């Protein structure tokens, strides 16, 4: 299955958001990150992807497709915007939940990550 995540200056969750900010996918599914407004990108957060997964980074304004196979949670961020974060989860019972959940980001970033994890049923 293929999914889309858009990058926005403003959403229900406030300034600088991924929409949706959480997505549960099956191994082999893809997500394309599509900027709706200028000035955004996507990249993995340091230490927040599974064993077996590779880090990634897009250019500002670039449509960027990633295939997710390794099970677990994947924290993503936007380089220029500090609060702009999201989580992609592959499978059930992710093994690296604590890497995201137990992290120490600014309050707004951490609350968005934590809400994403809860939305995903963790
Ligand atoms: Cl592009
Ligand atoms: Cu952004």
Swiss-Prot record:
Principal place of residence: periplasm
Subcellular location per the Swiss-Prot or TrEMBL entry: Periplasm
Cofactors: Cu cation
This protein's GO CC annotations: periplasmic space
GO molecular function, one term: electron transfer activity
Statement: the UniProt record of this protein carries the keyword Transit peptide: no
Coiled coil regions, renumbered to chain: none
Cofactor binding comment, as recorded: Binds 1 copper ion per subunit.
Source domain of life: Bacteria
Alphabetized UniProt keyword annotations: Copper, Electron transport, Metal-binding, Periplasm, Signal, Transport
Domain Plastocyanin-like as annotated: residue spans: 5-91
Function: This soluble electron transfer copper protein is required for the inactivation of copper-containing nitrite reductase in the presence of oxygen.
This protein's name: Pseudoazurin
Species, as recorded: Achromobacter cycloclastes
